[PDB]
Amino acid sequence: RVQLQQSGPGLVKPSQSLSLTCTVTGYSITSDFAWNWIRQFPGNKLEWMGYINYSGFTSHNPSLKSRISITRDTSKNQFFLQLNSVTTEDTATYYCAGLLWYDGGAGSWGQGTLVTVSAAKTTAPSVYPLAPVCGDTTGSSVTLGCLVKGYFPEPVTLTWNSGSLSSGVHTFPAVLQSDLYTLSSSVTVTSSTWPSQSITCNVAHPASSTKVDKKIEPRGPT
């Protein structure tokens, strides 16, 4: 049906502006819907920011006290958010969401885009392989991992074997310290399959245009 997708810069300096785009497919933005911006803060906190509806009429939350502009480009089937004078309190996940004007039905949200408001520098991660100790490889399953350390801002993407290894994976929320994040992921496989079937963690950090594909090598002779 209708599908929405947010895009725009993930890192904004304090006192500047965030600018996001929502691209709508499967429906014309000039029909039936209100096109909303909503953001989410830690702690399950959602804030309605405003809409532009199918006829170009807008509305926004008074909480955003003259900082917000919601606009559209019908030739592109897109609508837009500008939020000026940002501070670290505007760090949030930003969603676009269409709801029908008539009844609030058919709510359809984008995937969300994290926007970090910070003066800290973009930094590419180091990706380190976590190979199991020898003593831990003699059972029926074995666990391997990857440590993605020292990057900024979020997010990174991490997959195993280009996404073909998805079961038995745990990817943990990143932890922030000194303006750099660290994330880990584990993968568990049947021990007799390793090292015969190799295992590689694939990490991408779009903010720094960096990718790392780290094959996990066993400890011991390789």
Partner: peptide
């Protein structure tokens, strides 16, 4: 939990830092 401990990678040890990771899954 299934518990697994991992030493620092040789790559990280060339860096000056050393992280030890434990998963409790």
């Amino acid at each position: 939990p299934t518990v697994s401990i991992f030493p620092p990678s040789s790559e990280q040890l060339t860096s000056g830092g050393a992280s030890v990771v434990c998963f409790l899954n």
